[PDB]
Ligand binder design. Structure first.
Ligand SMILES: [Cl-]
Ligand SMILES: [Cl-]
Ligand SMILES: [Cl-]
Ligand code: NA
Ligand code: NA
Length: 172
């Protein structure tokens, strides 16, 4: 990464440790500071309640002067997986990019957009039932079918194992 980008993104992670944004866990790949991974916890008064949504922010080589590419990995019913999402703070809008936006601000914009129904490149149309099904299955998806989640968030995989144990044992 450039030295400027590396310093900036290191500080952004520190700021998130100090004041963790509601609903959002995020950190750099330990092998590439430009590639960040996040986990959004679905807010309760949405069809995403109980869901666990992993995705990435990929900062470009010219960060902080160009925006990240924003993708969601976990199937979710709102955004097509593994696809760059057209958000106000994203690489679709380099024209109105503000270098000063924090990573928390960018991620909060993703979450705020996600819980609206506004259409944009990368969004998809599903029913409420489909979103709820995907939310319910998201923890399993991340625990068993998501290679990158296991590599980046192994401590969360272990938490997930307990969560799924309790769901299975307490309901059967
Ligand atoms: Cl390029
Ligand atoms: Cl535009
Ligand atoms: Cl714009
Ligand atoms: Na590690
Ligand atoms: Na490594």
């Amino acid at each position: 990464a450039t030295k400027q980008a590396h310093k900036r993104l290191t500080k952004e992670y520190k700021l998130m440790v100090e004041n963790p944004p509601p609903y959002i866990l995020a950190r750099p790949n330990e092998d590439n500071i430009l590639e960040w991974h996040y986990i959004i916890t679905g807010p309760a008064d949405t069809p995403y309640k109980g869901g666990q949504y992993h995705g990435t922010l990929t900062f470009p080589s010219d960060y902080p002067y160009k925006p990240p590419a924003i993708r969601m990995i976990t199937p979710n019913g709102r955004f097509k997986p593994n696809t760059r999402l057209c958000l106000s703070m994203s690489d679709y809008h380099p024209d109105t990019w503000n270098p000063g936006w924090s990573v928390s601000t960018i991620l909060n914009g993703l979450l705020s957009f996600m819980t609206s129904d506004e259409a944009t490149t990368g969004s998809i149309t599903t029913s409420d039932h489909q979103k709820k099904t995907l939310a319910r299955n998201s923890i399993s998806y991340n625990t068993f079918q998501n290679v990158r989640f296991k590599l980046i968030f192994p401590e969360v995989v272990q938490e997930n194992v307990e969560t799924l144990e309790k769901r299975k044992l307490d309901e059967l």
